[PDB]
């Protein structure tokens with residue numbers, strides 16, 4: 001096993017200016033270390049603290065264009081996570097809100113980017129366990145990143161072997177990648193809407209899966225179906241998913257059928273301490 005020499009930066013509370021509440025608490029704000037203003041998100045009992053420090057550990061250990069980056073922690077009254085602000089929100093809200101504006105090219109490119117980040121996480125021998133459209137953040141419509149590592153080592157995103165046997169592999173992640181692509185292609189529909197979680201186990205054993213989304217050629221829907229094989233080893237590899245969705249993004253409309261187809265500010269992606 002190789003030593004994890006990731007650095008953990010600890011930040012002064014007086015370096016932040018919380019701008020407003022993003023959700024509840026996670027705030028939006030500016031981090032001023034150097035003549036630079038970094039736009040950031042800021043996540044504010046003993047069990048609670050042990051679980052945010054776990055997230056910092058994972059996030060400080062990853063470095064990839066399609067994974068979310070830690071900027072630091074702050075050790076005040078509670079623990080604060082400081083990450084890069086993704087100004088367009090999570091991808092689930094974004095497809096819901098811009099239903100009538102997403103082109104086939106954007107959808108296929110997101111599937112490539114999410115698969116690229118998952119492939120990176122496999123490189124780093126790391127299992128996400130909570131891949132979902134709600135946990136993919138949008139930096140620009142052109143650039144998305146995987147986030148939320150509270151489970152890194154939800155019934156309706158889990159491989160069947162995870163529901164039955166509490167078994168998680170990179171191939172159980174590919175199953176969740178499958179469900180996540182289906183969220184995108186249905187513009188934010190809820191997987192198994194109405195179906196109570198207690199039932200998901202037996203349904204999947206009976207051979208049923210999520211249905212073909214309307215904009216989806218059989219080419220795209222067959223890739224989702226392959227992510228849902230009961231035999232984990234028969235599921236596609238995250239690196240084959242990159243290849244396949246890449247070839248599709250070269251000709252998006254053959255595969256997705258859609259009607260109508262502040263002065264010293266620096267994105268965290270350009271602050272490379």
Ligand SMILES: */C=C\C(=O)Nc1cc(Nc2nccc(-c3c[nH]c4ccccc34)n2)c(OC)cc1N(C)CCN(C)C
Nearest residue numbers: 022023024026041083084085086087088089090093134137
């Ligand atoms: C889908 C929920 C969401 O994330 N919405 C969101 C996110 C950001 N930017 C951002 N950047 C990095 C991390 C986070 C983050 C981490 N946990 C949470 C929890 C709640 C909200 C954000 C979180 N977020 C936005 O920047 C402007 C906006 C935004 N929106 C659109 C809020 C939508 N609902 C959830 C309030």
